């Protein structure tokens, strides 16, 4: 069975050391696995670009085209806005953006 490949737009001048290890395709590490103080921190980790990335604590996000709250990659591959709902095929990067 052939497996699909979903393409995510991202700038050319990208630090290639990110992709040499187990990275995250959103460009900014997310998830519920980072907690400790409050409850409304999921949007803060995933979408608040005032503060830095959780994993690489030097920069906000790797690409600003698929990481903001309403960026191109987030508008195109999130399940909340549901732009690709009618397509019968699988988007393999749906689990990283929702």
């Amino acid at each position: 069975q052939a497996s699909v490949c979903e393409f995510v737009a991202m700038p050319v001048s990208t630090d290639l050391q990110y992709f040499r290890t187990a990275c995250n395709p959103r460009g900014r590490a997310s998830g519920m696995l980072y907690m400790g103080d409050r409850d409304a921190d999921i949007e803060a980790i995933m979408f608040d670009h005032t503060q830095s990335d959780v994993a690489y604590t030097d920069r906000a996000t790797l690409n600003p085209w698929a990481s903001q709250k309403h960026s191109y990659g987030d508008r195109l591959y999130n399940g909340t806005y549901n732009l690709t709902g009618a397509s019968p095929i699988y988007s393999p990067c749906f689990k990283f953006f929702t």
Binding site: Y34, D37, D41, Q51, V54, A55, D58
Partner: protein, 49 residues
């Protein structure tokens, strides 16, 4: 830290502190509480320690 000899112009040290705040992680809070601990701004979850 406080206690050293301050600069003569307040706008100079304000711009200098603002620029030093950019490009860094831990910074003094912007209200700058006189009689404060000057605790750095807490963030969301931590990754690796």
């Amino acid at each position: 830290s406080r206690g050293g000899v301050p600069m003569l112009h307040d706008n100079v040290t304000e711009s200098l502190r603002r620029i030093t705040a950019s490009g860094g992680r831990l910074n003094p809070t912007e209200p700058l509480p006189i009689f404060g601990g000057l605790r750095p701004a807490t963030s969301a979850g931590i990754a690796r320690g």
